[PDB]
Design a binder for this molecule. Structure first.
Ligand SMILES: NC(=O)C1=CN([C@@H]2O[C@H](COP(=O)(O)OP(=O)(O)OC[C@H]3O[C@@H](n4cnc5c(N)ncnc54)[C@H](OP(=O)(O)O)[C@@H]3O)[C@@H](O)[C@H]2O)C=CC1
Ligand SMILES: NC(=O)C1=CN([C@@H]2O[C@H](COP(=O)(O)OP(=O)(O)OC[C@H]3O[C@@H](n4cnc5c(N)ncnc54)[C@H](OP(=O)(O)O)[C@@H]3O)[C@@H](O)[C@H]2O)C=CC1
Lengths: 369, 369
């Protein structure tokens, strides 16, 4: 099987390449690397000599592939995908971009949750598989056990999303802002007797100055937060908040009687892990022990963290989860509103299960079929 | 009126002193400054000569006062208050500490919300007024218009709390961690050709190293978050989470039929502003227009922000709010769950309305009556 890799050099592409090498996926395929700016240059060697970098916009060369995994971006897909399908290409298009996500011909891939849907799609001619919004994937990887049993009446999700989710330059900007903040008061901080209010005044002024690097976020992120991600929609939601409801329900195949999912998506100063504080209304008053069981047994990556202070601080955080495929869920308890109200706090790496991993897994499933 | 000041030198006390100077509160009282570390030397001069520093632990001295405003802390209140009351002192004790908050002889003070209760208390013998938990005060300052009309059935609050809530040293630690993170990749941070994954790798290692400065938080805060604040309670709640409901209902005078308030309190890398994402269940389907008016007209500090991307990014954040008495609230909209489900996001400075402001206002109220 000849598999084309587009967008392998970017952020999500690099995590994918790294994962494909670790799982030795290249041993199972004939890799062909593409580029939109380094055509002709020798292709990267991840174990196999793939030759030179091909032209990512050459529909005719793309047509000779059996599948394509693209991490290039939405505009790329919009430009190339239509022309490629129209050229008669019937190969598998595995995309990280949100472009085709809601197309009737496409399946949002998150196999630990919807393997059956994916298989039925493969067995019935579906050739387009798209990774879901990073936030949706991480939410379902944590609560799949509940949704799977149709136990969720509705769910409010307040998120704490990492800078990396907006882009590599956004992550760089976050760390730069951190340095600028510290630079401004490094002397005072070194002086044990310095005034905290003096340090505070200086930090606020620094964050508010024109020199503070905010090209990418538009406003400060380090030392602050931004309660709005992506474009505004007519009902007042941001596109980020809207995606949760429509994507989760498509993944679960609940379009006919969707579960209401809503909340506020907030950008915080975390590097690359998204965390979510959920208010889950259950259709029944299930004993907490059984709830923890349903959650834990859903997949190999979710992890129920005991509702104890010390352990929660050490394991239910971005510092702990970053760079791993682990999806811890903690603070599980019934809420003051009633025993059919379940509180849950989860953390997940949005570059792995939230981006690269489903693409990886989808190729292995297709190969296995 | 002779008023003793205890804890005027610390973080909260310093914010209080500056506010008392700005409002010219000292022109209406005879201030007596107390110390827990050194006496006999001249007291601070915030306008008028106040004499020497008095022994904050001397019962006889405290008995000579008409009131005491203390920001010293609970340890101090526990040592002094009981003895002072047992000694027959009937003066007003205005406290920033949580010690007496749920005491049957104490009223939690947040006059823009419960002036009536405070006045009633003063006219009927109540001599102890305690400022509420910062998160409670900030939430009620933003949503008072709704609670005042008994329109809230329940509310789920997911917070984003600043380092200052934990203390001056915690704020310093947050900034130091930011510096350590930046230092680790400072050299390549600005080079767009360097691997963002390698940068991420180094930041992750740095945060995980034993030498990362975590003496106060125990784990990293900068670049991460900690979904647990204060000690665990027998149900699944942390003490911080538990406070919200009991304190809010006491302030509102609904202890016999309380509004269920619950959620997860999370510490994030902000300096001195607490933000909250609320899922508000209304008892009736009220037009969003009326809700906005109700919220906006409740007090002089709440500020309702249009539900638009750019204005939200610049107005509804700690960067905007820090060091000010403004309490913006935005993202107001009905949720997918139904027209009686209201989403809201608010930000407030936890050292002002969340700590110092209620104390000086209570003093002014007592002076007037
Ligand atoms: N960030 C996240 O957490 C998530 C992102 N996604 C999606 O994944 C897709 C790709 O995102 P992302 O990987 O962040 O995009 P990047 O900008 O990091 O990479 C995309 C392309 O930009 C080109 N490029 C230009 N300059 C550079 C450079 N200096 N270094 C490396 N590549 C460069 C490369 O193409 P070429 O080699 O041809 O020049 C690369 O393939 C997007 O559609 C995004 O929405 C989905 C879920 C999560
Ligand atoms: N931080 C926050 O956001 C909030 C705090 N609170 C409460 O306010 C109370 C006080 O907190 P906080 O103000 O942070 O306590 P601080 O540690 O900042 O100050 C308390 C006392 O420590 C002594 N002290 C010792 N060294 C110093 C120093 N180098 N500089 C200044 N003072 C020093 C002073 O007492 P002396 O002059 O007698 O030596 C001072 O009054 C607590 O009960 C807390 O729970 C309530 C809501 C919010």
């Amino acid at each position: 099987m000849r598999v084309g890799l587009v967008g392998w050099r970017g952020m999500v592409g690099s995590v994918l390449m790294q994962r494909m090498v670790e799982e030795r996926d290249f041993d199972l395929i004939e890799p062909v690397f593409f580029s939109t700016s380094q055509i002709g240059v020798p292709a990267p060697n991840f174990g196999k000599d793939a030759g030179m970098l091909h032209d990512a916009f050459d529909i005719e060369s793309l047509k000779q592939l059996d599948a394509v995994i693209t991490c290039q971006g939405g505009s790329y897909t919009e430009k190339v995908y239509p022309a490629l399908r129209q050229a008669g290409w019937k190969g598998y298009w595995i995309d990280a971009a949100s472009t085709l996500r809601m197309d009737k011909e496409a399946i949002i891939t998150l196999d630990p949750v919807n393997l059956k849907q994916i298989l039925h799609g493969i067995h019935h001619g579906t050739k387009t598989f798209v990774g879901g919004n990073c936030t949706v994937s991480l939410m379902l990887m944590a609560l799949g056990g509940l949704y799977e049993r149709g136990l969720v009446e509705w769910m409010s999700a307040m998120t704490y999303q990492a800078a990396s989710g907006a882009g590599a330059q956004n992550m760089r900007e976050l760390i730069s802002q951190m340095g600028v903040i510290n630079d401004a008061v490094s002397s005072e901080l070194a002086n044990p007797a310095s005034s905290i209010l003096d340090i505070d005044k200086k930090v606020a002024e620094t964050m508010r100055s024109g020199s503070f690097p905010t090209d990418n976020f538009g406003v400060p992120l380090a030392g602050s937060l931004i309660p709005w991600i992506d474009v505004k929609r007519d009902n007042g939601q941001s596109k980020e908040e809207w995606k949760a409801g429509v994507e989760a329900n498509k993944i679960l195949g609940l379009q006919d009687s969707p579960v209401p999912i809503d909340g506020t998506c907030v950008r915080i100063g975390a590097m690359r892990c998204h965390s979510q504080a959920l208010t889950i209304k259950l259709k029944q008053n299930i004993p907490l022990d059984e709830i923890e069981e349903m959650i834990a047994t859903h997949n190999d990556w979710v992890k129920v963290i005991p509702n104890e202070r010390d352990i929660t601080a050490r394991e239910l955080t971005p510092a702990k989860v970053t760079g791993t495929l682990s999806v811890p869920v903690g603070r599980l308890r019934k809420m003051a509103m009633g025993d059919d109200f379940l509180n849950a706090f989860t953390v997940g790496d949005q570059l792995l299960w939230g981006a690269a991993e489903p693409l990886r897994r989808t190729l292995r499933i297709i190969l296995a079929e």
